[PDB]
Enzyme design. Sequence first.
Site, short mmCIF file in Angstrom:
data_model
loop_
_atom_site.label_atom_id
_atom_site.label_comp_id
_atom_site.label_asym_id
_atom_site.label_seq_id
_atom_site.Cartn_x
_atom_site.Cartn_y
_atom_site.Cartn_z
N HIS A 20 -5.44 -6.04 -4.18
CA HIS A 20 -6.21 -6.07 -3.08
C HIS A 20 -6.62 -7.82 -2.75
CE1 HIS A 20 -8.30 -1.75 -2.86
NE2 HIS A 20 -7.41 -1.84 -2.55
N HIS B 91 0.46 4.27 -2.52
CA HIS B 91 0.45 5.92 -2.21
C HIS B 91 1.17 6.70 -2.58
CE1 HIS B 91 -3.86 5.14 0.54
NE2 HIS B 91 -3.73 4.79 -0.02
N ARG C 70 0.48 -1.63 -0.15
CA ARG C 70 0.07 0.21 -0.09
C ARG C 70 0.94 1.42 -0.12
NH1 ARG C 70 -3.46 2.70 4.05
NH2 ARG C 70 -4.86 3.85 3.26
N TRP D 139 -10.61 -9.11 1.97
CA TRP D 139 -10.93 -9.63 1.00
C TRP D 139 -10.90 -10.63 0.24
CZ3 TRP D 139 -7.47 -5.19 1.05
CH2 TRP D 139 -8.63 -4.17 0.81
C1 HEM Z 1 -9.74 2.51 -6.57
C2 HEM Z 1 -8.39 2.35 -6.02
C3 HEM Z 1 -8.27 2.38 -4.17
C4 HEM Z 1 -8.57 2.41 -3.68
C5 HEM Z 1 -10.43 3.27 -3.27
C6 HEM Z 1 -8.33 1.52 -2.41
C7 HEM Z 1 -8.61 1.68 -1.15
C8 HEM Z 1 -7.94 0.68 -0.45
C9 HEM Z 1 -8.51 1.18 1.35
C10 HEM Z 1 -9.61 1.99 1.56
C11 HEM Z 1 -8.05 0.52 1.92
C12 HEM Z 1 -7.86 0.00 3.34
C13 HEM Z 1 -6.57 0.96 3.79
C14 HEM Z 1 -7.65 0.70 5.52
O1 HEM Z 1 -8.29 0.76 5.99
O2 HEM Z 1 -6.27 -0.66 6.12
C15 HEM Z 1 -6.83 -0.42 0.73
C16 HEM Z 1 -6.15 -0.92 0.99
C17 HEM Z 1 -4.77 -1.75 0.04
N1 HEM Z 1 -4.75 -1.82 -0.98
FE1 HEM Z 1 -5.96 -0.30 -2.30
N2 HEM Z 1 -7.42 0.69 -3.35
C18 HEM Z 1 -7.21 2.03 -4.52
C19 HEM Z 1 -5.74 0.38 -4.97
C20 HEM Z 1 -5.47 0.15 -4.57
C21 HEM Z 1 -3.93 -0.24 -4.98
C22 HEM Z 1 -3.99 0.73 -6.83
C23 HEM Z 1 -3.75 -1.26 -4.89
C24 HEM Z 1 -1.85 -1.47 -5.13
C25 HEM Z 1 -1.29 -1.13 -5.00
C26 HEM Z 1 -4.16 -1.06 -3.32
C27 HEM Z 1 -3.26 -1.95 -2.31
C28 HEM Z 1 -3.93 -1.67 -1.50
C29 HEM Z 1 -3.13 -2.50 -0.61
C30 HEM Z 1 -1.73 -4.23 -0.23
C31 HEM Z 1 -3.91 -2.26 1.02
C32 HEM Z 1 -3.77 -3.28 1.56
C33 HEM Z 1 -3.39 -2.62 3.34
C34 HEM Z 1 -3.49 -3.13 4.53
O3 HEM Z 1 -3.33 -4.58 4.30
O4 HEM Z 1 -3.08 -2.86 5.34
N3 HEM Z 1 -4.83 -0.59 -3.57
N4 HEM Z 1 -7.26 0.13 -0.04
#
Ligand code: HEM
EC number: 1.11.1.5
Length: 293
Positions: free
Chosen positions: A174, A51, A47, A190
């Site tokens: 995700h 970001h 993430r 997910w």
């Molecule tokens: C539509 C675009 C995206 C949205 C709206 C989005 C939104 C989110 C949100 C809300 C989380 C959860 C954060 C939390 O509260 O713990 C998340 C997690 C994550 N996102 Fe997305 N994300 C997007 C795109 C991506 C992309 C492109 C990647 C790839 C690089 C990505 C990778 C991740 C990963 C790995 C997590 C997990 C983080 C964790 O587990 O702590 N996301 N995303």
Amino acid sequence: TPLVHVASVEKGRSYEDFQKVYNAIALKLREDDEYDNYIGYGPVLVRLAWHTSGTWDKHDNTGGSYGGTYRFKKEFNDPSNAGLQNGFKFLEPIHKEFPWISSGDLFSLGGVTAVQEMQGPKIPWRCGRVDTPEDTTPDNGRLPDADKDADYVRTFFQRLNMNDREVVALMGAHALGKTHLKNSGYEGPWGAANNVFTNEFYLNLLNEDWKLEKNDANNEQWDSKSGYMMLPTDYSLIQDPKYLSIVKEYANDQDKFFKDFSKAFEKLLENGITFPKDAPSPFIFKTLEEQGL
Ligand code: HEM
């Protein structure tokens, strides 16, 4: 008028030096394994790589991974970045051990490292990002909202010069980790294997019985009887007929997903950066498993 950001290899370093950093990160990921209920730091590292790269704007070449500006408070405190401090503190000790690496190269390498150590594809990686000063930090608001639909997703990613296939491949990440109520106002994973990189996100999207519910934070998300969830932006991939074709493709072909993710993710981490012709070729790091470590 657009800035140019040219990659400059940190002085005298070569492939053995960066492989040493990769190894330090990989070893810590394997040891510091209790984080987030034994998910580990893999997903928050991915993430964080995303970001710090995803503030890029193709129009004026501002933001992106180059300057490593997440280290400044404006960006560090972006509400969109809530939770990422855990990934920053994981990396801090690595940076003290290897103070020669730029912040950009470290944040991006941490994402590459985490994907590979979670059994994902090899991601070629290039060094050379240079720390830029605080005045170059992008303003908040450049990262995407989760409560929108397929047209918003498509439009958002055009800023990053990503097309339909790239966007769908990238969202496959995700599969990893989960949402956390206090970070983002969404809660739940997910899928089941959330620290192994697989095409599980596309499978669950197609195969699960999704119900639109409201969570304790008053946001809508899709939930399944298995205990998984999808953001509205995730679920919009099966509502849009162009996206849906690619979701079905990756659901039915693991290898293709892996190859397409690798390409798209590398591009994400390199957007905005000009590499001299005499820059070294992309590095492909060996995993701990391949090194026998
Ligand atoms: C539509 C675009 C995206 C949205 C709206 C989005 C939104 C989110 C949100 C809300 C989380 C959860 C954060 C939390 O509260 O713990 C998340 C997690 C994550 N996102 Fe997305 N994300 C997007 C795109 C991506 C992309 C492109 C990647 C790839 C690089 C990505 C990778 C991740 C990963 C790995 C997590 C997990 C983080 C964790 O587990 O702590 N996301 N995303």
